């Protein structure tokens, strides 16, 4: 019985022919400043990433999201520097194409265990609902939160079915400022799935 809908809302519900066509993929984003929204990850534990390689992780912004920083977790202190950024995604291939934004300065991967917050060079960015890809690069084998798992293996093209799950995309890129055109990923990490969260503005 749909009688409760009119009592709660005052209007009749709108059933469209494909059931679920209007349903967003996310319940909603709380735009209270200081909060962090994470991507779809299987396990938020520490693993050491390969240096001088860009790690690409999918992030589904299912509704308009106003962000002001990129937050990533360091599990164990490794002396080094890291750069983070956000890229668009080509729907035809799932590859990152254009750099939405990146941190104004490199973040330290050592000193303490916790969260590193990097202010984006555009200040405040309003992302319309689409798939984006967070890219993280480091000059050292930084130990970051997020490992491989079976819950995210559906988003990445696998060369073979893995037993312990798959991680993120990896591309060869000397550490530095992230380029406007994302280098094409050439391998799927079998153990690393770094998480870069968006801080609400």
């Amino acid at each position: 019985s749909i009688a409760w809908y009119r009592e709660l809302y005052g209007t009749e519900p709108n059933f469209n022919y494909p059931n679920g066509v209007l349903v967003p993929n996310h319940p909603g984003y709380n735009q209270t400043p200081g909060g962090i929204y994470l991507p779809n990850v299987a396990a938020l534990s520490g693993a050491a990433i390969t240096a001088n390689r860009i790690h690409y992780v999918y992030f589904q912004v299912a509704q308009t999201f106003v962000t002001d920083a990129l937050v990533f977790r360091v599990s164990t202190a490794v002396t080094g520097n890291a750069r983070v950024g956000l890229y668009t995604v080509d729907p035809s291939s799932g590859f990152p194409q254009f750099l939405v934004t990146q941190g104004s300065a490199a973040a330290l991967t050592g000193g303490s265990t916790g969260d590193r917050v990097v202010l984006i060079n555009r200040g405040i960015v309003t992302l319309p609902p689409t798939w984006y890809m967070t890219a993280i690069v480091s000059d050292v084998a930084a130990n970051l939160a997020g490992i491989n798992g079976s819950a995210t293996a559906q988003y990445y093209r696998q060369p073979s079915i893995p037993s312990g799950g798959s991680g993120c995309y990896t591309a060869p890129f000397t550490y530095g400022v992230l380029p406007d055109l994302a280098p094409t990923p050439d391998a799927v990490s079998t153990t690393n799935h770094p998480v870069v969260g968006l801080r609400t503005a």
Partner: protein, 88 residues
């Protein structure tokens, strides 16, 4: 004997979907922009996709003057109508 060994065009999957009436790469829509060519042996046009890029070629035994000319003309008209840059 004069032989055409290659008549190949490269597109993005989005542009191909626009001109193939939304259908994927390996299928040629009869009401699309790649249908209506002179078939000599089989399907005159074959398309494939890789890494978001669509390759459209004329089949091995269908590469006569008419098919090449008509494919070029259709690509011209399609790019001009849809404001798609023809980089070549």
């Amino acid at each position: 004997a004069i032989t055409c060994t290659a008549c190949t065009f490269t597109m993005t999957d989005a542009e191909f979907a626009i001109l193939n009436e939304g259908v994927a790469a390996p299928t040629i829509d009869p009401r699309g922009s790649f249908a209506g060519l002179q078939s000599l042996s089989g399907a005159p046009i074959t398309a494939s996709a890789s890494a978001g890029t669509t390759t459209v070629v004329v089949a091995a035994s269908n590469r006569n003057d008419a098919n090449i000319r008509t494919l070029a003309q259709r690509l011209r008209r399609a790019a001009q109508a849809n404001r798609i840059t023809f980089t070549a």
